[model samples]
Target chain A: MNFNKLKFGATIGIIGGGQLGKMMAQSAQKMGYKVVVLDPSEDCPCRYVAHEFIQAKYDDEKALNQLGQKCDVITYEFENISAQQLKLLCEKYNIPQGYQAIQLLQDRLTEKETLKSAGTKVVPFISVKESTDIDKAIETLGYPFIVKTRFGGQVLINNEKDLQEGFKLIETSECVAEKYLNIKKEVSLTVTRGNNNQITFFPLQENEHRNQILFKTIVPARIDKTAEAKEQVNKIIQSIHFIGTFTVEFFIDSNNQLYVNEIAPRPHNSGHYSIEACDYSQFDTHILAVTGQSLPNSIELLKPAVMMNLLGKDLDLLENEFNEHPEWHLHIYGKSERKDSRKMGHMTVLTNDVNQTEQDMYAKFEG
Target chain B: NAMNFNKLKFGATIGIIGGGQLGKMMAQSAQKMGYKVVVLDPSEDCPCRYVAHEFIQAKYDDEKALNQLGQKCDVITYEFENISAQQLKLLCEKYNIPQGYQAIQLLQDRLTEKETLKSAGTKVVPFISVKESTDIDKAIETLGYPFIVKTRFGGQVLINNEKDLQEGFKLIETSECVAEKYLNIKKEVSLTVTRGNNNQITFFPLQENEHRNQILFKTIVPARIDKTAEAKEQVNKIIQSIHFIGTFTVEFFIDSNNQLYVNEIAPRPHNSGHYSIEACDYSQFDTHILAVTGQSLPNSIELLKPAVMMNLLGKDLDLLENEFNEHPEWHLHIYGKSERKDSRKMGHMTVLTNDVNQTEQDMYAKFE
Candidate 1:
């Protein structure tokens, strides 16, 4: 497949219509590219901003071909579908970023193995096939571990009794039992690597989760390992010859050791702060990488920031707050319905004092 | 016409004239706010066409085009200064045009602009209008050599001697011109003022402008001058007197002794303010939209960092095409224009930096 260097006004086809696609569409349109989005829902966030919207399923071969025929290059926002489904159309059309990275990272079993072979440390785990393997799995990795689906479903196990209960919750699905470590802090690093091999790493962003759902992210993460985190991200992108933006998340233990926990093969939620804080945002870099244009060497944060994700419940309150404080950039993903834990939109607070901003933001949203 | 002078909520349509880069950038802001944009220009491939919601392909003076624009849009604004302000003033009263025609009309005549500024207690460069042959001799005797002779319509020819002065006077097609004494200038700077409908004002940090062959070269923000307080004082008087309702830029020529004199004023977003897109809290275009739409003025504007803006002419693109990948911080904005010729403004490069000198050096090294 040939990745053509598309002109400024050429159409860029996006395969999903989530907020990530919405932001990417905004960046491309500002740079003077027409955007066409393909999604099952006509009312998706990207639909409002896109020049044209195509309503269809993600794996619908007919819909995918229509997108391929109408655009210069294709990219996707969410990874709900497998890379195998994209491979045929990818070869027929130009997928400048390629599909191998997503293919390798989608499954838990393969992701851990890839991480290990790529010279990174991951939490120890034992893959389980049948109910009988429970005993051997527990013996292999001690108790108080977690049994996770080959995808992302997770169940907690404290002992043999908990294993039966946990395995029952994940009944008959191929899974892995991983030794759980006492985590100190969770942080993620996003890097945009172009075909030219030029790499631009955003500062490490620290995240806070409640009910295993991300609630907030503070960038220029108050940690001292920004340099180390960036070095690790650079190596990861190089190993895969990654051609677009990606994020690899790591959990730092109390002793300051980092273990790679997950990899997302697209513009990430954690990198959203770069849109307001950095000189060159992640979305802009991603467009450059996929369009066969030049990539930036490195990205710099103009302001230290705190990005607060808007759950569906927080939308109305945040809307009024945004009107009062015009300084804060608030982006709402035009979702019609709001549900618990759904990411409705996000607001980024750029300031000299991160701690105070976090407290101020907490009061605004928490109340 | 019952015009809703109240604040325009989101999703309102904004109509603009002259689809150049300024209109293109403004359309971006309108789109970000979820506002629909309709533009009127002669070419279907105008710079703003790609981002605009609808493009009305017609000349600015065409009545049919003007009717279509005014009928479709809630608010109307123009980018080019050459439009007949009086006709648009009559045509656009039914729509809420925040910036009235008087302001534009006053800016169109050079003599009236100087008179308006002087009437508002501001200092303009020493100049004399020539109406007769005797007026030229009197001007030469009064303003001295190295002064300039001009047609009021921008035919400014610098006269170094009496022979050149006589020849310069013959070139005034309008039979009217103003000759001004040329001062030994230290530097030039400009300020963009956003006047809200409620009479509140926001000022962009002063810009230090450097010119080459009468075209803008680079504009550095937070201009290096100790007289910013005085400059602000003078500009506020001029803007307040004009009672403007949108963004306008005032150019000032700083003499060697650090005295400031009014140079000229543009009635729309100026080239120097383009740096605000990436470096300021809100872009100048954004604030302009807020002002005209009667939206609450931003409490204030904060310059996130210093910046250097370089205008891209037709010749710079070949060099710039290869330079984007090298510097991540270098922002390249290309207006989707069709043809390229020398001195035609194609695009611009904005570099964020604390040191303007170093950034300028890097720009030259990469492009030249």
Candidate 2:
């Protein structure tokens, strides 16, 4: 398990073909690396930029073997891939970001426990064995707790009727129950850890979600716990021995107490603003870190920025915004689907005042 | 026949003539804007081959390949000036070549380029035309000793005395040449100007250039010269005198007495403007794509920070690769060329800093 510096013109294999893979391929291409992506969709966004594409399912051993044979180093774009299959492939290939990080992050129960054991503050959570465990959860955590699948979405249980309905929805899968909190703000920090143990952090991002989907990310997040949040992220990365870029999300209560929410083992949507607002973007640093290249000591923020995600329904509005706003850095993922809530693209606006930028973004996007 | 100036919708195909680093960067920008790119180059493994949506492996002068590209793409542009002007003129008539071929025809010859600059009310160094070997004596009589005799097509030889003049004339081996009086130059600078649809014009920040062995070594943005506005005005005069569109660069020489002289004009993105990719709101390639695609130009071009762009020739690659370990903030760009020739441009790096002198000194110390 030696991680050596990759030379120019080396091939980088990406495991997924979503927008994250597309943007990652773009950054790697800029640094003179060839990109090959393995995704099930033939027309994935990465198909446009990557040098080669292998249309295969994430769990296909045959396809994973082919990717391992072609690439000098391999990394992933998302954490939903099967860790067991990747663990088997890692024995023969150089997957610098080993499957250990993803295995720990794949299960909500283990993720929260890992964070807690690393001396990090996390929201109180308890594992649920079956549907009847909801009653015990309510007894210890009180009413209005959240019932979540160990690997998927969640449902809120506020009363007897709600618990009966929520349990029916999440009963088929392994679950965890957590005490819901009165959240004040949701923020995240993106950090890149090089193979040499050097770490670089982008500015904090304050996120807003509508219908449980990320709507906007404001940089220089309106919080004073940046130092504390960064230290927490460092401790978590060290605990897992993770290399490459990852984001640690947090929930701040009204009393300004920080609680670790979750960890994304890949570049999160919140760090997209760094493409235009910071000196080295998260994608840039991610490629550097995973390739055994040196990471910068500090990442500089060029300006205050607001990044607004464009859902499938916002495609028409994006056409008008493209012509009207020349200063906006618009990125359109070449996805064919137009289903509602699908992430079609994003636009980043850099400004002198984050408050006004956020207001202007809402005004243009709200309609 | 009137040319159609219709704006191309996003996802339109852009055809590029050369597939070098400039073409690769252009394809990168156009793709970011949701446009497709097809490039025509002779090399099978050209730099743009990996980035472009499609690659047509044919020589630049191949008529069949050029026509196929023109038919497939919505607009046509070239990255280098070596393409035949007459062939491009035909493509312009059949397709949307908004940049036109007049600039290429005029700038391809040294004598015509200087004549055009002089007619445009621009300042140029003193020069005399030499049609043949016999005309060299007359040129020397007019421009005096220590002048430059350059082939009308390209390449130059310095003639300092009688022995040097005889050797220089034989070295040129050309019937048509231009002899110019050389001046003691203090600094060299360049400005990139773009003329978009509807006569909209824009100018990038002035760049101070340093050349080593006649190749561009470094470019300092926001050149430390006081006569920037004056140089920009001269560039405006030349731009107005032509029927060209898209981005073009005007190289100027600042002599010891602070007099600015137009050295040359490149009817495409110049190497010195590469720093704009990281230091500006929009890069020169971005502006070029906007102009050629019939999109509206920005009201102004903004320099986001002070930067220095250093070109990495083939010989400097190993040195810079080692430097990459220590200077991670440096934005390194590798062209991914197959061969590494000593003088060939392999890649470049741009550093955005508040202290230009310190960064410049650091680069010089390492490269030297």
Best by lDDT: 2
> Per-residue lDDT for A1-367 in model 2, tens only?
3387886788999999898998898889889899999999987878767888899998888998899889998999996468788788777888778888788877889988988899899888888867667778888887878888887466898777787767776667888889888899999999988866788889889999898899999998988778999888877876886678889899998888999887887888999999888888899999998888888888888877899898877776666547546577777776767777798888888888999888888888876
Query: What is the per-residue lDDT of model 2 for residues B88-191, given as tens digits with 9 covering 90 to 100?
Result: 88888898788888888888788988888889899989898887777887877889677898888746778878878767768446457888988789999998
Candidate 2, lDDT over the whole model = 0.84
Instruction: Indicate which candidate wins on TM-score.
Output: 2
Clashes of 2: 0
Q: How high is the lDDT of residue A10 in model 1? A: 81
DockQ each candidate and list the results.
Answer: 0.31, 0.54
Considering summed lDDT, which 10 consecutive residues are worst modelled in model 2 chain B? B1-10
> Which candidate achieves the best DockQ against the true structure?
2
Q: CA RMSD for every model?
A: 3.7, 2.0
The true-versus-predicted C-alpha distance at residue A353 of model 2, in Å, is 2.1
For every candidate, how close is chain A to the native chain A in TM-score? Answer: 0.94, 0.96
